[PDB]
Amino acid sequence: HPETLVKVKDAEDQLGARVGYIELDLNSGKILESFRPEERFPMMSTFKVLLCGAVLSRIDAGQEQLGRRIHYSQNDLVEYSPVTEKHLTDGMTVRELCSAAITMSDNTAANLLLTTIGGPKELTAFLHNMGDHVTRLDRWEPELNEAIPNDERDTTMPAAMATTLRKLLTGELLTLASRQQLIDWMEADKVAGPLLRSALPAGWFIADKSGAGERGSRGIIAALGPDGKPSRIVVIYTTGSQATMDERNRQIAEIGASLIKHW
Ligand SMILES: *C(=O)/C=C/N[C@@H](C(=O)O)[C@](C)(Cn1ccnn1)[SH](=O)=O
């Protein structure tokens, strides 16, 4: 809606930074609203949904199992590993690692899952293979969050990320069971509370993944809709702001309130 576009531009003003925005119809793929849809932004922890999509694709092909147990050491742990830091002696299943990467944004869990598929360049190959020639991962946690201005490493465009999320959640790309598992992890997201979830009324469905990086980078990808079912994809990215985490949270929440109000 035009008034959501007014609020996206007001968010640029308040953050002193670029904001990218797209709304897709989940069913048809049609673009309902866009701002800077083909400019690049750092993905930050939003890549973790694409990573677990690549993992589920391998499970579908008989090349991985949800139940396989992985052992790791102290020296694998990076900053913010609230689940993985508790399982040094017993390890974690692939299932537990995707849950920790998506719902808790555990950084070690994402690194362990990147190891299973052969690193960032194999996530990029998975994406090329399904028709996304824009989205790219180049680095591991934590360096992929550096957000150097004009650096195209570890970036997407709002339009590319929205199309890719749609193909993962509703295509023939994953099996029915794998689609359902990916959206179930995103629905149990525990660390996106002050973003679209704070504007979302009781009775609405949301499956999302949030991201934060250096140089005021912030973002969210989501499947949401009324009556307990998703019917739209929303992608919001910003980078460059000097504003506090609270002020960046508040601007994305206000974009959310406007999207809901003018649904
Ligand atoms: C999700 O988007 C994860 C990004 N990681 C950032 C962040 O959450 O801001 C980390 C945890 C921030 N950080 C760096 C050093 N100390 N904290 S890191 O993984 O870039």
Nearest to 111, CA basis, from 83, 139, 92, 134: 139
| Unique residue bearing structure tokens 């506090």 | 244
The amino acid occupying position 67 is G
| Unique residue bearing structure tokens 């953050």 | 15
Rounded Cα distance between 166 and 189, Å, is 18
Q: What is the resolution of this structure in A?
A: 2.3
Sign of CA dihedral 192, 193, 195, 200: positive
Residue of the CA atom closest to atom 18 of ligand 1: 142
As a three-state string, the secondary structure of the chain is: CHHHHHHHHHHHHHHCCEEEEEEEECCCCCEEEEECCCCCEECHHHHHHHHHHHHHHHHHCCCCCCCCEECCCHHHCCCCCCCHHHCCCCCEEHHHHHHHHHHCCCHHHHHHHHHHHCCHHHHHHHHHHCCCCCCCCCCCCCHHHCCCCCCCCCEECHHHHHHHHHHHHHCCCCCHHHHHHHHHHHHCCCCCCCCHHHHCCCCCEEEEEEEECCCCCEEEEEEEECCCCCCEEEEEEEECCCCCHHHHHHHHHHHHHHHHHCC
Distance 79 CA to ligand 1 centre (A): 7
Rounded Cα distance between 130 and 40, Å, is 19
Is residue 209 marked as binding?
Answer: yes
The Cα-based distances of 137 to 3, 20, 143, 181, 259 in angstroms read 34, 19, 11, 23, 29
Residue 59's domain comprises 2-262
Bridge partners of residue 19, in order along the sequence:
238
The amino acid occupying position 6 is V
Number of domains in the chain: 1
Over the Cα atoms of the chain, what is R_g? 17
Distance 261 CA to ligand 1 centre (A): 32
Is residue 167 marked as binding?
Answer: no
- β-strands 205-212, 155-156 pairing: unpaired
Task: Decide whether any atom of ligand 1 lies within 6 Å of the 37 Cβ.
Answer: no
- Measured from the Cα of 213, ligand 1's closest atom is 9
Distance 242 CA to ligand 1 centre (A): 16
Instruction: Indicate left, alpha or beta for 118 from its phi (over 0: left) and psi (-120 to 50: alpha).
Output: left
Question: Helices 176-187 and 47-60 sit at what angle, rounded to 10 degrees?
Answer: 150
**CB 253, CB 195: distance < 8 Å:** yes
- β-strands 218-225, 205-212 pairing: antiparallel
Sign of CA dihedral 190, 194, 197, 202: positive
Residue of the CA atom closest to atom 13 of ligand 1: 79
Token pair belonging to 148: 């150097």
> 45 catalytic, yes or no?
yes
Cα Dmax for the chain: 54
Residue of the CA atom closest to atom 17 of ligand 1: 79
> 231 catalytic, yes or no?
no
As a three-state string, the secondary structure of 117-172 is: HCCHHHHHHHHHHCCCCCCCCCCCCCHHHCCCCCCCCCEECHHHHHHHHHHHHHCC
Nearest to 236, CA basis, from 248, 252, 258, 216: 252
CA 233 to chain CA centroid, Å, is 12
- Measured from the Cα of 44, ligand 1's closest atom is 2
Say which CATH number the domain at 225 has: 3.40.710.10
Is residue 86 marked as binding?
Answer: no
CA 148 to chain CA centroid, Å, is 19
Rounded Cα distance between 25 and 223, Å, is 10
Please tell me which residue in 38, 85, 143, 152 is annotated as part of the active site.
Answer: 143
Structural determination approach: X-ray
Sign of CA dihedral 166, 171, 103, 98: negative
